[PDB]
Amino acid sequence: RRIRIALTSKNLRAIEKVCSDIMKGAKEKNLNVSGPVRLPVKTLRITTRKSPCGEGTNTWDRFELRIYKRLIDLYSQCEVVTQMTSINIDPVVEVEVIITDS
C-alpha cells in the first residue's frame, strides 16, 4: 500500500547490515521491493584550537560527524511491515515507517 521504510544512523556497518536483513527478510514473502536509495552523506564539522591556554604555535584539529541514510519502498500491509521491522534491531539505527499514498 506504498509503505516507505527510512533508516538513519552514524555507523555504516550497522545500517548496511540492517538494510540487508530487511531486504532479504521481505523477499522471503514474495514482495515487490524497491532497492535501497542511498541519499547523500552529510558531515558535521567543528574546528577548535588545542592548547587550553594561549601560548605556543597555533595548531587546530578538525572534527567530523557524518550521517548515513537509506530508503526502501514496497507494497504490503501495515501490520506485516511493522512486525518485519521490529526484531530488536541493533539500537544504533533509527527506523520509521510512513505511508506515501499521495
Q: Cβ(4)–Cβ(37) under 8 Å?
A: no
Strand partners, 99: 3
Q: Mask: binding to RNA, 51-70, rule CB under 7 A, as x and -?
A: xxxxxx----x------x--
Residue at 82: amino acid letter: T
Decide: is 41 part of the binding site for other proteins (CB under 8 A): no
Q: Which residues of 69-89 are buried (b: 16+ CB within 10 A; e: fewer)?
A: bbbbebebeeeebeebbeeeb
- Could you identify the residue written with the cell 530488536? 88
Q: Cβ(85)–Cβ(93) under 8 Å?
A: no
Shortest CB 43 distance to RNA, Å: 5
Residue 41 or 99: which CB sits closer to other proteins? Answer: 41
Residue 43 binding: pick among other proteins, RNA, none (C-beta 5-8 Å cut-off by kind):
RNA
Which of 1, 28, 3 minimizes the C-alpha distance to 96? 3
Residue 49 or 77: which CB sits closer to RNA? Answer: 49
Among residues 38, 75, 78, 99, which is the contact residue for RNA, using CB under 7 A? 38
Q: Mask: binding to other proteins, 53-92, rule CB under 8 A, as x and -?
A: -----xxxxxxxx---------------------------
